[PDB]
Amino acid sequence: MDVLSKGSLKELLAHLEKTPLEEAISYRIGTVPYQNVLISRNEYYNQLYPDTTSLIDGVSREGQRNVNGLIMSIISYVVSGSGHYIPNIGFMLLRRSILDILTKHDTGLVTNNLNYGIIARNLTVSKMNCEQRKRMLICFKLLAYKDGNQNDYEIYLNQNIPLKQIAPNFIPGDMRTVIHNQDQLAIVGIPAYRLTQSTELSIRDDNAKSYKLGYVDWYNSNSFLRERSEFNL
Amino acid sequence: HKYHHLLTSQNSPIDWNYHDEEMHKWLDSRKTTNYDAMQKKDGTVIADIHIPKVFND
Amino acid sequence: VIKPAAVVAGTSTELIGNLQAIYSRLRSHSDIGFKKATVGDVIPNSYMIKPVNSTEY
Amino acid sequence: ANRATSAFLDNPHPVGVNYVDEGSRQFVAVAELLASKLIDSSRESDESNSDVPFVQAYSKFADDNPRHLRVKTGGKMANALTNVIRSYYSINAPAIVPQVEIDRLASKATVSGDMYNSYAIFNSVPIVEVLSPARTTVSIVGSDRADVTMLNTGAGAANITFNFGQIAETVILKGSVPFQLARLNQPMPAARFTYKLRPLDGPFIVVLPVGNPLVISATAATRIQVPLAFNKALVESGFQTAMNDGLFDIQNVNYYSSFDEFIISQYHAQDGINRVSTCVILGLALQAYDQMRRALPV
Amino acid sequence: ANRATSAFLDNPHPVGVNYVDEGSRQFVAVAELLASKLIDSSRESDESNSDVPFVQAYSKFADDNPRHLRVKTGGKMANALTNVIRSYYSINAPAIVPQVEIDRLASKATVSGDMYNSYAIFNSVPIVEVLSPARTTVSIVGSDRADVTMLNTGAGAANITFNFGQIAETVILKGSVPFQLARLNQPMPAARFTYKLRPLDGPFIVVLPVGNPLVISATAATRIQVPLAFNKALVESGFQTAMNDGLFDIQNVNYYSSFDEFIISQYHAQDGINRVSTCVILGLALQAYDQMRRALPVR
Amino acid sequence: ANRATSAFLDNPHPVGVNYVDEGSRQFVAVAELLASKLIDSSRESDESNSDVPFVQAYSKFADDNPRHLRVKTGGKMANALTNVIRSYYSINAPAIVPQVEIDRLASKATVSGDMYNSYAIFNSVPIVEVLSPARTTVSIVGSDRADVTMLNTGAGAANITFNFGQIAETVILKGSVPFQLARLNQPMPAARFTYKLRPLDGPFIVVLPVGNPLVISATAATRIQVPLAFNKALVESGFQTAMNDGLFDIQNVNYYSSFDEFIISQYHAQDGINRVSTCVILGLALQAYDQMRRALPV
Amino acid sequence: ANRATSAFLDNPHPVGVNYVDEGSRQFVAVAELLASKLIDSSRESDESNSDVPFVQAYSKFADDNPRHLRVKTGGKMANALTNVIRSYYSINAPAIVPQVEIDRLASKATVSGDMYNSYAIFNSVPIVEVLSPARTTVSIVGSDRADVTMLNTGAGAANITFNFGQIAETVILKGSVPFQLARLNQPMPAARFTYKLRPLDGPFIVVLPVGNPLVISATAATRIQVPLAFNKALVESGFQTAMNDGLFDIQNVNYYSSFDEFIISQYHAQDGINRVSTCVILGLALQAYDQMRRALPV
Amino acid sequence: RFGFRDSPFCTSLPRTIMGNDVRRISYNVFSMMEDIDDVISEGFILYDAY
């Protein structure tokens, strides 16, 4: 809910600096993705509603134990709000910040073999909105510039023309680009009053709607409950 | 395999009989042309050595 | 050949006709192949073109 | 045996998955409401011999005053409405409109955005399969009125199976000459011109006597939930306009003669009830496109 | 000789003889007027984000205040309109609406029961009979546009007689190839693509040459007196709705694809001048039915 | 070789050359505006219990106060409107109403005479010619939806050329069975159920296999500039009323099933652009004729 | 039969698909307006013996103050203008200028950016095909004025078919000696020196006597919608400069003598309307290029 | 054109700044905004008012 509230690149990067990798990994066992299922939407239809499960839903799903699974878990947290179940990663790695994983070599993770096309297909980029895609491209650029793969990122953008139009205008390692960036990346914000307490047909739309409706209540009450446990640590 | 059946069947997008007949008519014309070309360069006996008329199909 | 023939056929006679139709075409192509070696002309060979310095993406 | 299927029911292409949320539904409803006021204001301006009613309507729709030396394009609302129409048709469309832009355009007027307040009747006839035995020829022509022409060449009468799907509500069958039709495992009645059928009542068997061809004319009615502002006449005009403007020109898509065929074909696809909700929002957007473009041609 | 006739013209079932007086005609007009207010109020409720306009119009229509947990169906007015519609369609349908209920509902709004103020155009093509010789085949398909396919297998040219009835005003005939058509005992003209005909002129003879088949497309237009509130689009939508809900499922009745077919079929039957009056009231009732259900839907 | 053509495209008759000036265009625009108010005043009068809204509307239209025991024809406006419709249809029809009378009736309301601000979509299919080989039979039926039935009795497959003209913007081809179609001197693609074509691309070649006949259904959409008040539903009703009232009965004219067939046929004639301009003015006059006659049936 | 066609109409290459948006169009209009001021200040500085007028104009155009011992190329506007001209010509030419640079440069002056306000007349004569019998020989020379030389060596008179396309509005034919010309299915008139023809009317037949060769000179006029600032003299000069400076030379592109030939050839290709729209923006860009390069020879 | 220092006048309000479209908020929405501090950091256009 906090990560989805950020609406600027410099807010999003600041949040990733303070957030450990533990928050991007779920301890719930979940279900296997890419499964054709029938769900109940009784507000609209008497019959069951066909849908397919995906990693970028708001619900935690089982994840693979490879490096590909950990990168997919990070991106899913940014774009959907929840991570995936990857057990026994390691105490040292889980303490590191998300930005440290993406942009630093001291972590001990190797991401040179990652294929950006495969990761996008596994995350169902075709079903992602403009804000979600821009967030995903930010994570790709950070990973590419860490590995010296700047050319591969540009070539990958040439192949996918629609992704090129919405590519973020920031160069990692340059502070000027982050300062002057004017991107809008807020999936969840203070709702327009027109929003109602109604369900949505798709799994993704309903879960995103749930985050939107609960943002006002979370905004008012998160500070005190966080402080009630943070003090005397 | 469904596409394989379609290309074989009567409703194929390719008229196989028409193309096969034209290949046959193109091949024997080449045999006549190549045989005549060699009859001028060297003798008829040498032409029979290298392009036998017995072998057709 | 049995896989293409039975993908759509609903009767045993339907299946036998498809099998014979495919082999009629196959045997017609075998005759053309041998004729190509007897016309006095060289036959082209299949090839694949790949970039000199391939790029990952 | 031979199988005959309707042309428009074949291979429905996937539809877009974007701009189907509550916020985006309101924007389409806002565009329709504001586009209607543009048409009415132009009529009022012509009658009153004053451009003042049109200036207000254009300013609300386009966020800028009309100018004599600037082309009247409808502003940013027109661009957003055009882009969402492209996205609805196919999943391969770019879908580049920001969420901040959509939300600000939904605040121009207050509308519920509910797409289930009413219903509309669609007339496309879905013949999923016509199964005919040997020595018989069957041809299916037309979508709004389906004509099935059958010839019996063999020695005796033949039985022909008709499948109308499980979605259409009612189907009326009319023949050139009286004919016999009955459900599976049911006795055949006396020959008569007209049959009224429920498509959910299994496949239907038609007795085809030897001799002159028998032609069956089929009409069907299907009810699909639509918003209260839905108008089939305006949706049909917008669908034709969008095709001519190139809004539907994307790779790996199917083209239809009318929005009637488009919505029914997507309904009959596997898991087609997912697509029917997106198609209704597309129809409403086309209703806004027709009114806006007629008032502001480009 | 072989005889071919249009499918929709065959055996028109008798229409009802009840609820055709001035009091019942006023009730149908009142229902149509109130149903239009119901559909407009629902639009206003959407634009104002308030249920007051819709509750305001539903109270006038149903004489009851809408309450949550109770399904909104239209009240007693919906019950009367739905059952009166069934009686108009067939004479076998029962008459179950009391006269006290009709009089009370007719007094809700002031309106005239006049059903002959205006006119409308109906496009069903009446082909009463097509008479052909032995060695020819004739097939007729379609109602709005009728395609007549004729094939001649004999040695010489044959004459086909076309009867379009006496009710239709004009009939336009278009052929796939130029053809000759003339009235009875009249010299044949030169081959032409199109013919404009008056059905009252008499039976028409078509020369069918030996060879490829000749297809004649027929379009017809007829004038029927209707009230000013008549809207063809709304009437047709209500006709399909009434069919889907099963109100027209009565014993020994004939089913039509459109209201245009239904009204033309009843016109061409005997005592069709009396039948067409009842059909007009049914069309206005179906217009009220269409607007009522679209305002109050059921999944 | 055999040639097949659409029936409604054959021999378009010359249209009238009068009442096409700015003052005459204003009169038609005034007539449509005042006739629309006549139809709306009737509904408002019935809702209340006063004939005042109708009396005001009729007095403006007819220049005379309505009276009982009189037919209520419509006054001089109704007479003038009837005669100009006759003149538009044919160049043989006389021009009766003087220009002074037209100008006087045009001053009753202040409306612009522009007739080409907006556009409309017309769905008549212009199959100009279908060229077929010796051993093939081709039949064309229909105008709104054109069905072409072709049968090949020859030994091999035959190529059939389709020419849709240059005016239509899009043409959708649907087949009873999947078929192959390609442009001139172009490779044939795989068999497909539906095709979307631009008639300006060029003549198209359809492969007709030996066996059962193949039926292709064609639908077209052409955009024609019209006034904003144009309504296709009202124009078509007036066209039928015009033919039924016998004001299109002139020597040496061609008759059509609908206004849509009339306007597409004139577009494909020699001076297509000039002919269509007159027909659009005829369409607006017919729209006024329908509204006026429904309120005042004589 | 022998077929002869104009040379400049053969094989038009695809145009670029970048820099066609509203912001890009505004950039070209701003560049044209600023280039016009650059050449006006250069003349003023010469006549006033002061460099102040030129310094002010160059600073706005180039975003830097003029300095001695520097090249005075034209700044970032010159580079963007040069690169967009390359992209418009060919689809193979890369698009280098980022959209951020285009948008920043478009904010220098307020312009409409609409390229369809006005029109221009183009005088290239399109001869799509000339069909001749076996005995006759036909040769076509010229683009602005086309001379068709025909000689009949057969026994009798021959019929030569002329097709001028459908885009050209008026074609005027003049002959060395009086000749006979008529449309399809029309009577042949007496021999005249000159004919005025509408290419939309149809193919035209010329009777070629046996005696002496006949040369027909053809002139045509075509109307293409262009912005109001369009100047044909400046565009033609800019086109030649673009070719000389070598920014049109890429792989697989046709070359033309004038911008008139380039725009007409693209009109007659497939998707000609969309191609011509891009070529109009190239014409305005070439107009800006000619003025800026003449003010600052580099 | 006028030589003003830090001119508050633009020839037209820019459609895009730094490659992204400038956000537009109606005056009514901006009045009810409680997250106004986050919005002003990016910049916006106010409309629907005189």
* Distances, alpha carbon G188 to alpha carbons D145, G132, G197, G216, in Å: 49, 18, 14, 17
Cβ-based contacts of F49 with chain E (< 8 Å): 110
Name the one residue in this structure whose structure tokens are 């005027």: G172
**Chains in contact with B via at least 3 Cβ–Cβ pairs below 8 Å:** C, F
- Asked if H35 has any chain A CB less than 8 Å from its own CB, the reply is yes
Amino acid at D75: G
Using left for φ > 0, alpha for ψ between -120 and 50, and beta otherwise, residue F75 falls in left
Three-state SS string over chain A comes to: CHHHHCCCHHHHHHHHHHCEHHHHECCCCCECCCCEEEECCCCCCCCCEEEECCCCCCCCEECCCCHHHHHHHHHHHHHHCCCEECCCCCHHHHHCEHHHHHHCCCCCCCCCCCCHHHHHHHCCHHHCCHHHHHHHHHHHHHHHHHCCCHHHHHHHHHHCHHHHHCCCCCCCCCHHHHHCCCCCCCCCCCCCCCCCCCCCCCHHHHHHHHHHHCHHHHHHHHHHHHHHHHCCC
Per DSSP, D251 falls in state S
Give the count of beta carbons closer than 10 Å to the beta carbon of residue D61: 24
Give dist(CA F60, CA F74) in Å, integer.
10
Asked if G103 and H16 come within 8 Å (Cβ–Cβ), the reply is yes
Chains with 3+ CB–CB pairs under 8 A to E are D, F
d(CA F131, CA F158): 11
- Of D223, D125, D232, D228, the closest CA to residue D174 belongs to D125
- For A28, half-sphere exposure in the C-beta direction (CA atoms, 13 angstrom radius) is 11
d(CA D42, CA D55) in angstroms, rounded, equals 9
Resolution (A): 2.6
Contact of B11 with chain F, judged by CB distance below 8 Å, is answered with: yes
Residues in Cβ contact with G237 at an 8 Å cutoff, skipping those fewer than 6 apart? G290
Distance from CA of B14 to the nearest CA of F (A): 9
Q: What is the 3-state secondary structure (H, E, C) of chain G?
A: CEEECCCCCCCCCCCCCCCCCHHHHHHHHHHHHHHHHHHHHHHHHHHHCCCHHHHHHHHHHHCCCCCCCCCCCCHHHHHHHHHHHHHHHCCCCCCCCCHHHHHHHHCCCCCCCCCCCEEEEECCCCCCEEEECCCEEEEEECCCCEEEEEEECCCCCEEEEEECCCCCCEEEEEEEEEEEEEECCCCCCCCEEEEEECHHHCCEEEEECCCCCEEEEEEEEEEEEECCCCCHHHHHHHHHHHHHCCCCCCCCCCCCCCHHHHHHHHHHCCCHHHHHHHHHHHHHHHHHHHHHHHHCCC
**DSSP-derived secondary structure letter, E16:** P
Element (H, E) at E142: none
| Contacting residues of H for A190, CB less than 8 Å apart | 33-35
Q: Which residue has the tokens 């997106």?
A: D278
- State how far the Cα of D222 lies from the Cα of D120, in Å rounded to an integer: 8
Cα within 13 Å of Cα(A198), Cβ side: 15
How many other C-beta atoms can be found within 10 angstroms of the C-beta atom of residue D109?
Answer: 16
Could you tell me which residues are beta bridge partners of residue F118? F226
Q: Tell me how far apart the alpha carbons of residues A6 and A77 are, in angstroms, rounded to a whole number.
A: 13
| Bridge partners, residue F196, by sequence | F172
What's the CA gap between G176 and G208, in Å, rounded? 13
Backbone angles phi, psi at F40, to 5 degrees: -75, -35
Question: How many residues comprise chain D?
Answer: 298
Residue E239, token pair as written in the block: 């006709």
Contact by Cβ (8 Å): G109, G101: no
d(CA A195, CA D25): 11
Please tell me the distance from the alpha carbon of residue D117 to that of residue D225, in angstroms, as a whole number: 7
Least Cα distance to E140 among E6, E1, E284 occurs for: E6
Maximal CA-CA distance, chain H: 39
Yes or no: say if E262 and E243 are a contact pair by the CB < 8 Å rule. Answer: no
DSSP D162: E
- 């011992």: which residue's tokens? G69
CA dihedral for F95, F99, F101, F107, sign (positive or negative): positive
Instruction: Say if CB F106 and CB F112 are below 8 A apart.
Output: no
Rg of chain E (C-alpha set): 24
Mark whether H and G touch (3+ CB pairs within 8 Å): yes
Q: Which two tokens stand for residue F128?
A: 């100009």
* Cβ–Cβ under 8 Å, residues E137 and E1: no
Report the residue of chain A nearest H34, measured CA to CA. Answer: A190
C41 and B2 in contact by Cβ < 8 A? no
Which residues in D60-165 belong to E strands, given as ranges? Answer: 118-122, 129-132, 136-141, 146-152, 158-163
Which candidate from B13, B15, B18 shows the least CB-CB separation from F191? B13
CA-to-CA separations, G56 to C47, F21, G29, G104, in angstroms, rounded: 64, 53, 20, 19
**Please, where are the H alpha helices in chain F?**
22-47, 52-62, 75-89, 99-106, 232-244, 259-267, 272-295
Question: Which residues have a Cβ under 8 Å from the Cβ of E67 and sit 6 or more positions away?
Answer: none
Q: Which two tokens stand for residue E298?
A: 């059921």
| Rounded Cα gap, residues F297 and F238, in angstroms | 13
Query: Helix F52-62 and helix F22-47: axis angle, to 10°?
Result: 160
Closest alpha carbon within chain F to D3: F177
Q: Which pair of structure tokens corresponds to residue G134?
A: 């076996």
Give pairs for D90-93: CB < 8 Å, separation 24+: D90/D13, D90/D14, D90/D15, D90/D16, D90/D248, D90/D250, D90/D252, D90/D253, D91/A126, D91/D14, D91/D15, D91/D16, D91/D17, D92/D250, D92/D251, D92/D252, D92/D253, D93/D16, D93/D250
What's the gap in Å between the CA of A148 and the closest CA on chain C? 14
Closest CA to E144 of E128, E163, E130, E126: E126
Question: Which residues in chain D have Cβ-Cβ distances shorter than 8 Å to E11?
Answer: 193
Sign of CA dihedral F53, F54, F60, F64: negative
Are the Cβ atoms of D101 and H21 closer than 8 angstroms?
Answer: yes
What angle (nearest 5°) sits at the alpha carbon of residue A45, between those of residues A39 and A49? 25
Asked if residue E148 lies in contact with residue E216, where contact means CB atoms within 8 angstroms, the answer is yes
Main-chain phi, psi angles of F102, to 5 degrees: -65, -45
Reading phi first (left if > 0) and then psi (alpha if -120 to 50, else beta), residue A131 is in alpha
Encoded amino acid at G50, one letter: S
> Using the beta-carbon criterion (under 8 Å), do H11 and G108 form an inter-chain contact?
yes
> Is A112 near chain C, with CB under 8 Å?
no
Q: Which residues contact G136 (CB under 8 A, 6 or more apart)?
A: G2, G150, G151, G152, G153, G154, G158, G160, G208
**Half-sphere exposure of residue F32: CA atoms within 13 angstroms, side-chain side:** 27
C-alpha–C-alpha distance, residues B57 and C36, integer Å: 9
C45's tokens: 């060979």
Q: How far apart are CA G243 and CA G290, in angstroms?
A: 12
Cross-chain Cβ contact F7/E172 below 8 Å: no
Distance CA F17, CA F89 (A): 10
Q: Which residues of E touch F47 (CB under 8 A)?
A: 33, 111
Q: CA nearest F229 in D: which residue?
A: D43
Q: Do F240 and E121 touch (CB under 8 A)?
A: yes
Q: What is the DSSP letter of F229?
A: T
Upper half-sphere CA count for residue G7 (Cβ side, 13 Å): 14
Scanning E94-153 for CB atoms below 8 A from F yields 110-112, 117-119, 121, 145, 147
The minimum CA-CA distance between F184 and chain B, rounded to whole Å, is 18
* E-only strand ranges, chain D: 2-4, 118-122, 129-132, 136-141, 146-152, 158-163, 170-183, 192-197, 204-208, 214-226
Please give the single-letter amino acid code of residue G100: V
Nearest CA in chain F to D255: F196
Residue E222 near residue E204 (C-beta atoms within 8 A) = no
Strand partners, E4: E130
How many Å apart are CA F79 and CA F91, to the nearest integer? 19
Q: How far is C56 from chain B (nearest CA, A)?
A: 32
Residue found by looking up tokens 């106004």 in the block: H36
Cβ of D141 within 8 Å of Cβ of F217? The answer is yes
Is residue H34 less than 8 Å (CB to CB) from chain A? yes
Of A36, A51, A196, the CB nearest to D22: A196
Helix (H) or strand (E) holding D7: none
Q: Are F275 and F15 in contact (CB under 8 A)?
A: yes
Contact G131, G205 (CB under 8 A): no
Long-range contacts of A121-128 (CB under 8 A, 24+ apart): A122/A55, A122/A68, A122/A72, A123/A54, A123/A55, A123/A56, A123/A72, A123/A75, A123/A76, A123/A79, A124/A54, A124/A55, A124/A56, A125/A163, A126/D17, A126/D91, A127/A54, A127/A56, A127/A204, A127/D17, A128/A56, A128/A79
Q: Is E19 left (phi over 0), alpha (psi -120 to 50) or beta?
A: left
Query: CA of D96 to nearest chain G CA: how many angstroms apart?
Result: 15
Task: Give contacts of A209 with chain D, Cβ < 8 Å.
Answer: 21-22
Q: Hey, what's the torsion of the CAs at H24, H25, H26, H27, to 10 degrees?
A: -130
Q: Is D285 helix (H, G, I), strand (E, B) or coil?
A: helix
Nearest CA in chain E to F294: E118
For β-strands E158-163 and D158-163, DSSP reports them as unpaired
Neighbours of chain F (3+ CB pairs under 8 A): B, D, E, G
In degrees, rounded to 5, the angle at the alpha carbon of residue G270 between the alpha carbons of residues G268 and G273 is 70
Q: Residue G298, exposed/middle/buried by CB under 10 A (0-12, 13-18, 19+)?
A: exposed
Q: Angle, nearest 10°, between helix axes E272-295 and E232-245?
A: 80
Q: Which residues in chain E have their CB less than 8 angstroms from residue F237's CB?
A: 121
Chains touching chain H, criterion 3+ CB pairs below 8 Å: A, D, G
- Residues contacting C29, CB < 8 A, separation 6+: B20
Tell if the CB–CB gap between H25 and D104 is shorter than 8 Å: yes
Asked whether F174 and F125 are in contact (CB, 8 A), the reply is: no
Annotate E34-45 with b (16+ C-beta within 10 A) or e (fewer).
bbbbbbbbbbeb
Q: Of F153, F154, F175, nearest to F162 (Cα)?
A: F175
Q: How many CA atoms lie within 13 A of G11 on its CB side?
A: 4
Q: Residue A6: closest CA among chain H residues belongs to which residue?
A: H38
- Find, among A4, A1, A2, the residue nearest to A135 by Cα: A4
- The packing angle between helices E232-245 and E259-268, to 10°, is 90
**Half-sphere exposure for A168 (CA within 13 Å, toward CB):** 29
H41 has a chain A CB within 8 A of its CB: yes
Spatial distance between the Cα atoms of F101 and F171, rounded to a whole number of angstroms: 45
For A220, name the nearest residue in chain H, comparing CA atoms only. H34
Q: Which residue of G107, G108, G110, G112 is the best one to mutate when testing the H interface, meaning the one whose CB has the most H CBs within 10 A?
A: G107
**Sign of the four-CA dihedral F204, F209, F213, F217:** negative
Please give the Cα distance from H17 to A169 (Å, whole number): 11
Find, among A91, A109, A87, A89, the residue nearest to A99 by Cα.
A109
Helix boundaries (H) for chain E: 22-48, 52-62, 75-89, 99-106, 232-245, 259-268, 272-295
**Which residue has tokens 């459900």?**
D183
Is residue E24 exposed (0-12), middle (13-18) or buried (19+ Cβ within 10 Å)? buried
Give the closest residue to F180 by CA, choosing from B6, G104, E1.
Answer: B6
What does DSSP say about strands H24-26 and H45-47: parallel, antiparallel, or unpaired?
Answer: parallel
Neighbours of F80 (CB within 10 A): 20
Nearest to residue F179, comparing CAs of F155, F166, F162?
Answer: F162
Rounded to 5 degrees, φ, ψ at G160 are: -110, 125
In this structure, the dihedral spanned by the alpha carbons of residues A7, A12, A13 and A16, taken in order and rounded to 10 degrees, is 170
| R_g of chain F, CA atoms, integer Å | 24
Phi, psi for G279 (deg, rounded to 5): -65, -30
Kind plus residue range of the DSSP H or E element containing D9: none
> Determination method here?
cryo-EM
Q: How distant is the alpha carbon of residue E176 from its chain centre?
A: 29
Query: Of B11, B16, B22, which to mutate for an interface test with F (greatest number of F Cβ within 10 Å)?
Result: B11
B11/C contact by beta carbon, under 8 A? no
Closest by alpha carbon to E235, among E256, E219, E251? E256
CB of F193 less than 8 A from some CB of D = yes
Let me know the angle formed at the C-alpha of G27 by D294 and G96, rounded to the nearest 5 degrees.
115
- Distance, in Å, from the CA atom of F173 to the CA atom of F196, rounded to the nearest integer, reads 6
Strands (E), D40-191: 118-122, 129-132, 136-141, 146-152, 158-163, 170-183
Contact by Cβ (8 Å): D85, D286: yes
Q: Is G260 exposed, middle or buried (0-12, 13-18, 19+ CB in 10 A)?
A: buried
Query: Which residue from G185, G173, G178, G186 is spatially nearest to G130, judged by alpha carbons?
Result: G173
Q: Which two tokens stand for residue G233?
A: 């003299």
Q: Based on the number of CB atoms within 10 Å of its own CB, is A12 exposed (0-12), middle (13-18) or buried (19 or more)?
A: buried
- The Cα–Cα gap between A192 and H30 comes to 11
What is the rounded end-to-end Cα distance, in angstroms, of chain F?
A: 53
CA angle A140, A143, A144 (to 5 degrees): 80
Window 219-238 of F, Cβ < 8 Å to E: 233, 237
Chain F touches chain B, with at least 3 Cβ pairs below 8 Å, answer yes
Closest CA to D93 of D269, D292, D282: D282
Per-residue 3-state assignment (H helix, E strand, C coil) for D227-242:
CCCCCHHHHHHHHHHH
Q: For F25, how many CA atoms within 13 A lie in the half-sphere containing its CB? A: 16
